[PDB]
Amino acid sequence: MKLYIYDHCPYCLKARMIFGLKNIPVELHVLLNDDAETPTRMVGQKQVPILQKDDSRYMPESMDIVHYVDKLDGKPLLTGKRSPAIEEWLRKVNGYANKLLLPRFAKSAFDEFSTPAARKYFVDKKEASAGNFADLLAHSDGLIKNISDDLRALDKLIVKPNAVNGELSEDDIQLFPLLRNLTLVAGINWPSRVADYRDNMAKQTQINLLSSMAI
Ligand SMILES: N[C@@H](CCC(=O)N[C@@H](CS(=O)O)C(=O)NCC(=O)O)C(=O)O
Ligand SMILES: [Cl-]
Ligand SMILES: [Zn+2]
Ligand SMILES: [Zn+2]
């Protein structure tokens, strides 16, 4: 199977997670952020992730790909209970996390931004939507405090470092991509239980953390 992604893309990360959790090999391909032609040939419009199944057919939609791959061997892993507290925490943190992440993604060495035009495409589309990146970056100190404090709240909710609610669930697929991308943010104070969850899920999923290029 092949997965066509952006490295920063949280939807893409959800799809990458399930391959890692199931120990199913997959060939990753990072598309340039401005490449409409390639995803359009596969699924009809520019979007990632895109799965190429072992029958060569292409499938879009992270939700569909996650559940397709989880069921492949008739042994689904995503069986644990959902947590309203975790889901509510994610809604709260998603209220502002992109104010930190988008301007940092635009300055980072992800392969989807490896041409100038791709990087400019991202900046032009996301500034229009999120607002002036300079202004967002000038507000970093408050935003970094807010996420450090929110992670202190999450610390008390993590049941096991291998599964947020104790058994692997839909909530791990929603939580880990956010925690992975937040390792790009220099200055966050990571509590112990959250750092262990983040590291264990990075190891299980075989998805890299971003500490080495944090800004
Ligand atoms: N409903 C789809 C959403 C994928 C999506 O919007 N992905 C974004 C990248 S993410 O970093 O925001 C995307 O494909 N953007 C490309 C564009 O809109 O030009 C799914 O669940 O897989
Ligand atoms: Cl899902
Ligand atoms: Zn994106
Ligand atoms: Zn799901």
From TrEMBL:
Which positions fall inside the GST N-terminal domain? 1-77
Q: Which GO terms describe its cellular component?
A: cytosol
Protein name as annotated: Glutaredoxin
Q: Which organism is it from?
A: Escherichia coli
